[PDB]
Design a protein around this nucleic acid. Sequence first.
RNA 1: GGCCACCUGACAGUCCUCUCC
RNA 2: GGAGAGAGAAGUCAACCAGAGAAACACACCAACCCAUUGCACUCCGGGUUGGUGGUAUAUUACCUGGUACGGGGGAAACUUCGUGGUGGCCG
Length: 92
Amino acid sequence: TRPNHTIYINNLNEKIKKDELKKSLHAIFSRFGQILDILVSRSLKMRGQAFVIFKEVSSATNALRSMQGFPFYDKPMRIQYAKTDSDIIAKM
RNA sequence: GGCCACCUGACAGUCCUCUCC
RNA sequence: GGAGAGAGAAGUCAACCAGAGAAACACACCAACCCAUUGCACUCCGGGUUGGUGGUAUAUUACCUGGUACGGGGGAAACUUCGUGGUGGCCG
Ligand SMILES: [Ca+2]
Ligand SMILES: [Ca+2]
Ligand SMILES: [Ca+2]
Ligand SMILES: [Ca+2]
Ligand SMILES: [Ca+2]
Ligand SMILES: [Ca+2]
Ligand SMILES: [Ca+2]
Ligand SMILES: [Ca+2]
Ligand SMILES: [Ca+2]
Ligand SMILES: [Ca+2]
Ligand SMILES: [Ca+2]
Ligand SMILES: [Ca+2]
Ligand SMILES: [Ca+2]
Ligand SMILES: [Ca+2]
Ligand SMILES: [Ca+2]
Ligand SMILES: [Ca+2]
Ligand SMILES: [Ca+2]
Ligand SMILES: [Ca+2]
Ligand SMILES: [Ca+2]
Ligand SMILES: [Ca+2]
């Protein structure tokens, strides 16, 4: 997609509990820039996926490039820019 | 006296309907 | 959301009333597995199995203790005793 503040991550290990997943995700993407929020749900349609909202688009980009395919909980991470702005960025 | 279905009724954390706030 | 009412599923129960009073079932939540899902969201929330926990279910229908209504005993009497849905079919 086109650059976005938020990156969409899928092909994540569905067995990891929400709290732990969000914490590890925060630990791995922290270095690219300030993270405004990380959204994760284990519902039928959202499981295996996560939305990491960066304060700066440039951070979404470096994070996406450097971490594409990163082995996370035994599965290579797939990353794309989110198709639309996350509410906090849009309502901003 | 027992066992199954069924009938009437008592009981009425889900759901539906109605009234009021 | 909340408060009433109707109906009523599941399940338990049976002469009626009252005091005590579980279980069953329904529902919700948690855990572990299994199945399904590769899904672009920002109003939580897939299914199944096993186990567990919970509620003005703080219910009421078993059971328990009192009386009430007919029946069977016994006793001068007083009174004291046991028993109390409809229907068909099948089991000695
Ligand atoms: Ca979780
Ligand atoms: Ca979740
Ligand atoms: Ca890790
Ligand atoms: Ca795996
Ligand atoms: Ca309710
Ligand atoms: Ca008001
Ligand atoms: Ca309210
Ligand atoms: Ca209410
Ligand atoms: Ca009713
Ligand atoms: Ca019934
Ligand atoms: Ca009671
Ligand atoms: Ca009780
Ligand atoms: Ca129970
Ligand atoms: Ca349940
Ligand atoms: Ca699974
Ligand atoms: Ca698909
Ligand atoms: Ca979208
Ligand atoms: Ca939205
Ligand atoms: Ca929600
Ligand atoms: Ca009798």
